[PDB]
Amino acid sequence: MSLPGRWKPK
Amino acid sequence: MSLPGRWKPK
Amino acid sequence: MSLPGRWKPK
Amino acid sequence: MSLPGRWKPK
Amino acid sequence: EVKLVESGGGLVKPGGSLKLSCAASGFTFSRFGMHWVRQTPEKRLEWVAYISSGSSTIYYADTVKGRFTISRDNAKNTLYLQMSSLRSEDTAIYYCARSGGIERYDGTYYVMDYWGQGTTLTVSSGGSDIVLTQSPASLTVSLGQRATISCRASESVDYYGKSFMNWYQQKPGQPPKLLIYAASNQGSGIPARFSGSGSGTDFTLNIHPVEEEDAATYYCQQSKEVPWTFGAGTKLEIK
Amino acid sequence: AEVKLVESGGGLVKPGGSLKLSCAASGFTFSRFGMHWVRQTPEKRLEWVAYISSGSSTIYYADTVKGRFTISRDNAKNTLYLQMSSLRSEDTAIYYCARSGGIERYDGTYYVMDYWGQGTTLTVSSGSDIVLTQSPASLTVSLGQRATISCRASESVDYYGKSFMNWYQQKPGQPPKLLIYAASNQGSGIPARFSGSGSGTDFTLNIHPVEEEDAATYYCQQSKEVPWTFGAGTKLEIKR
Amino acid sequence: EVKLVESGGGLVKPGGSLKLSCAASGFTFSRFGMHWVRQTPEKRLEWVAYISSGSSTIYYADTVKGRFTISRDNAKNTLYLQMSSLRSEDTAIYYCARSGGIERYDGTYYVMDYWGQGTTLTVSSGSDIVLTQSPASLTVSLGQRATISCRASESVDYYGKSFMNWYQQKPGQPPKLLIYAASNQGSGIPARFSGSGSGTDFTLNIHPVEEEDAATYYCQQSKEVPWTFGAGTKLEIKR
Amino acid sequence: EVKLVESGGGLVKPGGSLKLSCAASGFTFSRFGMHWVRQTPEKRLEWVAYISSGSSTIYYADTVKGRFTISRDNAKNTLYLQMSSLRSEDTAIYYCARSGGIERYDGTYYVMDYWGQGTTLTVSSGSDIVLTQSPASLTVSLGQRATISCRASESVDYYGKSFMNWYQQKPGQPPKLLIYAASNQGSGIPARFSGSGSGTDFTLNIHPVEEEDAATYYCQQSKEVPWTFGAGTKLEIK
Question: What class, spelled out in words, does domain G3-123 have in CATH?
Answer without folding.
Answer: mainly beta
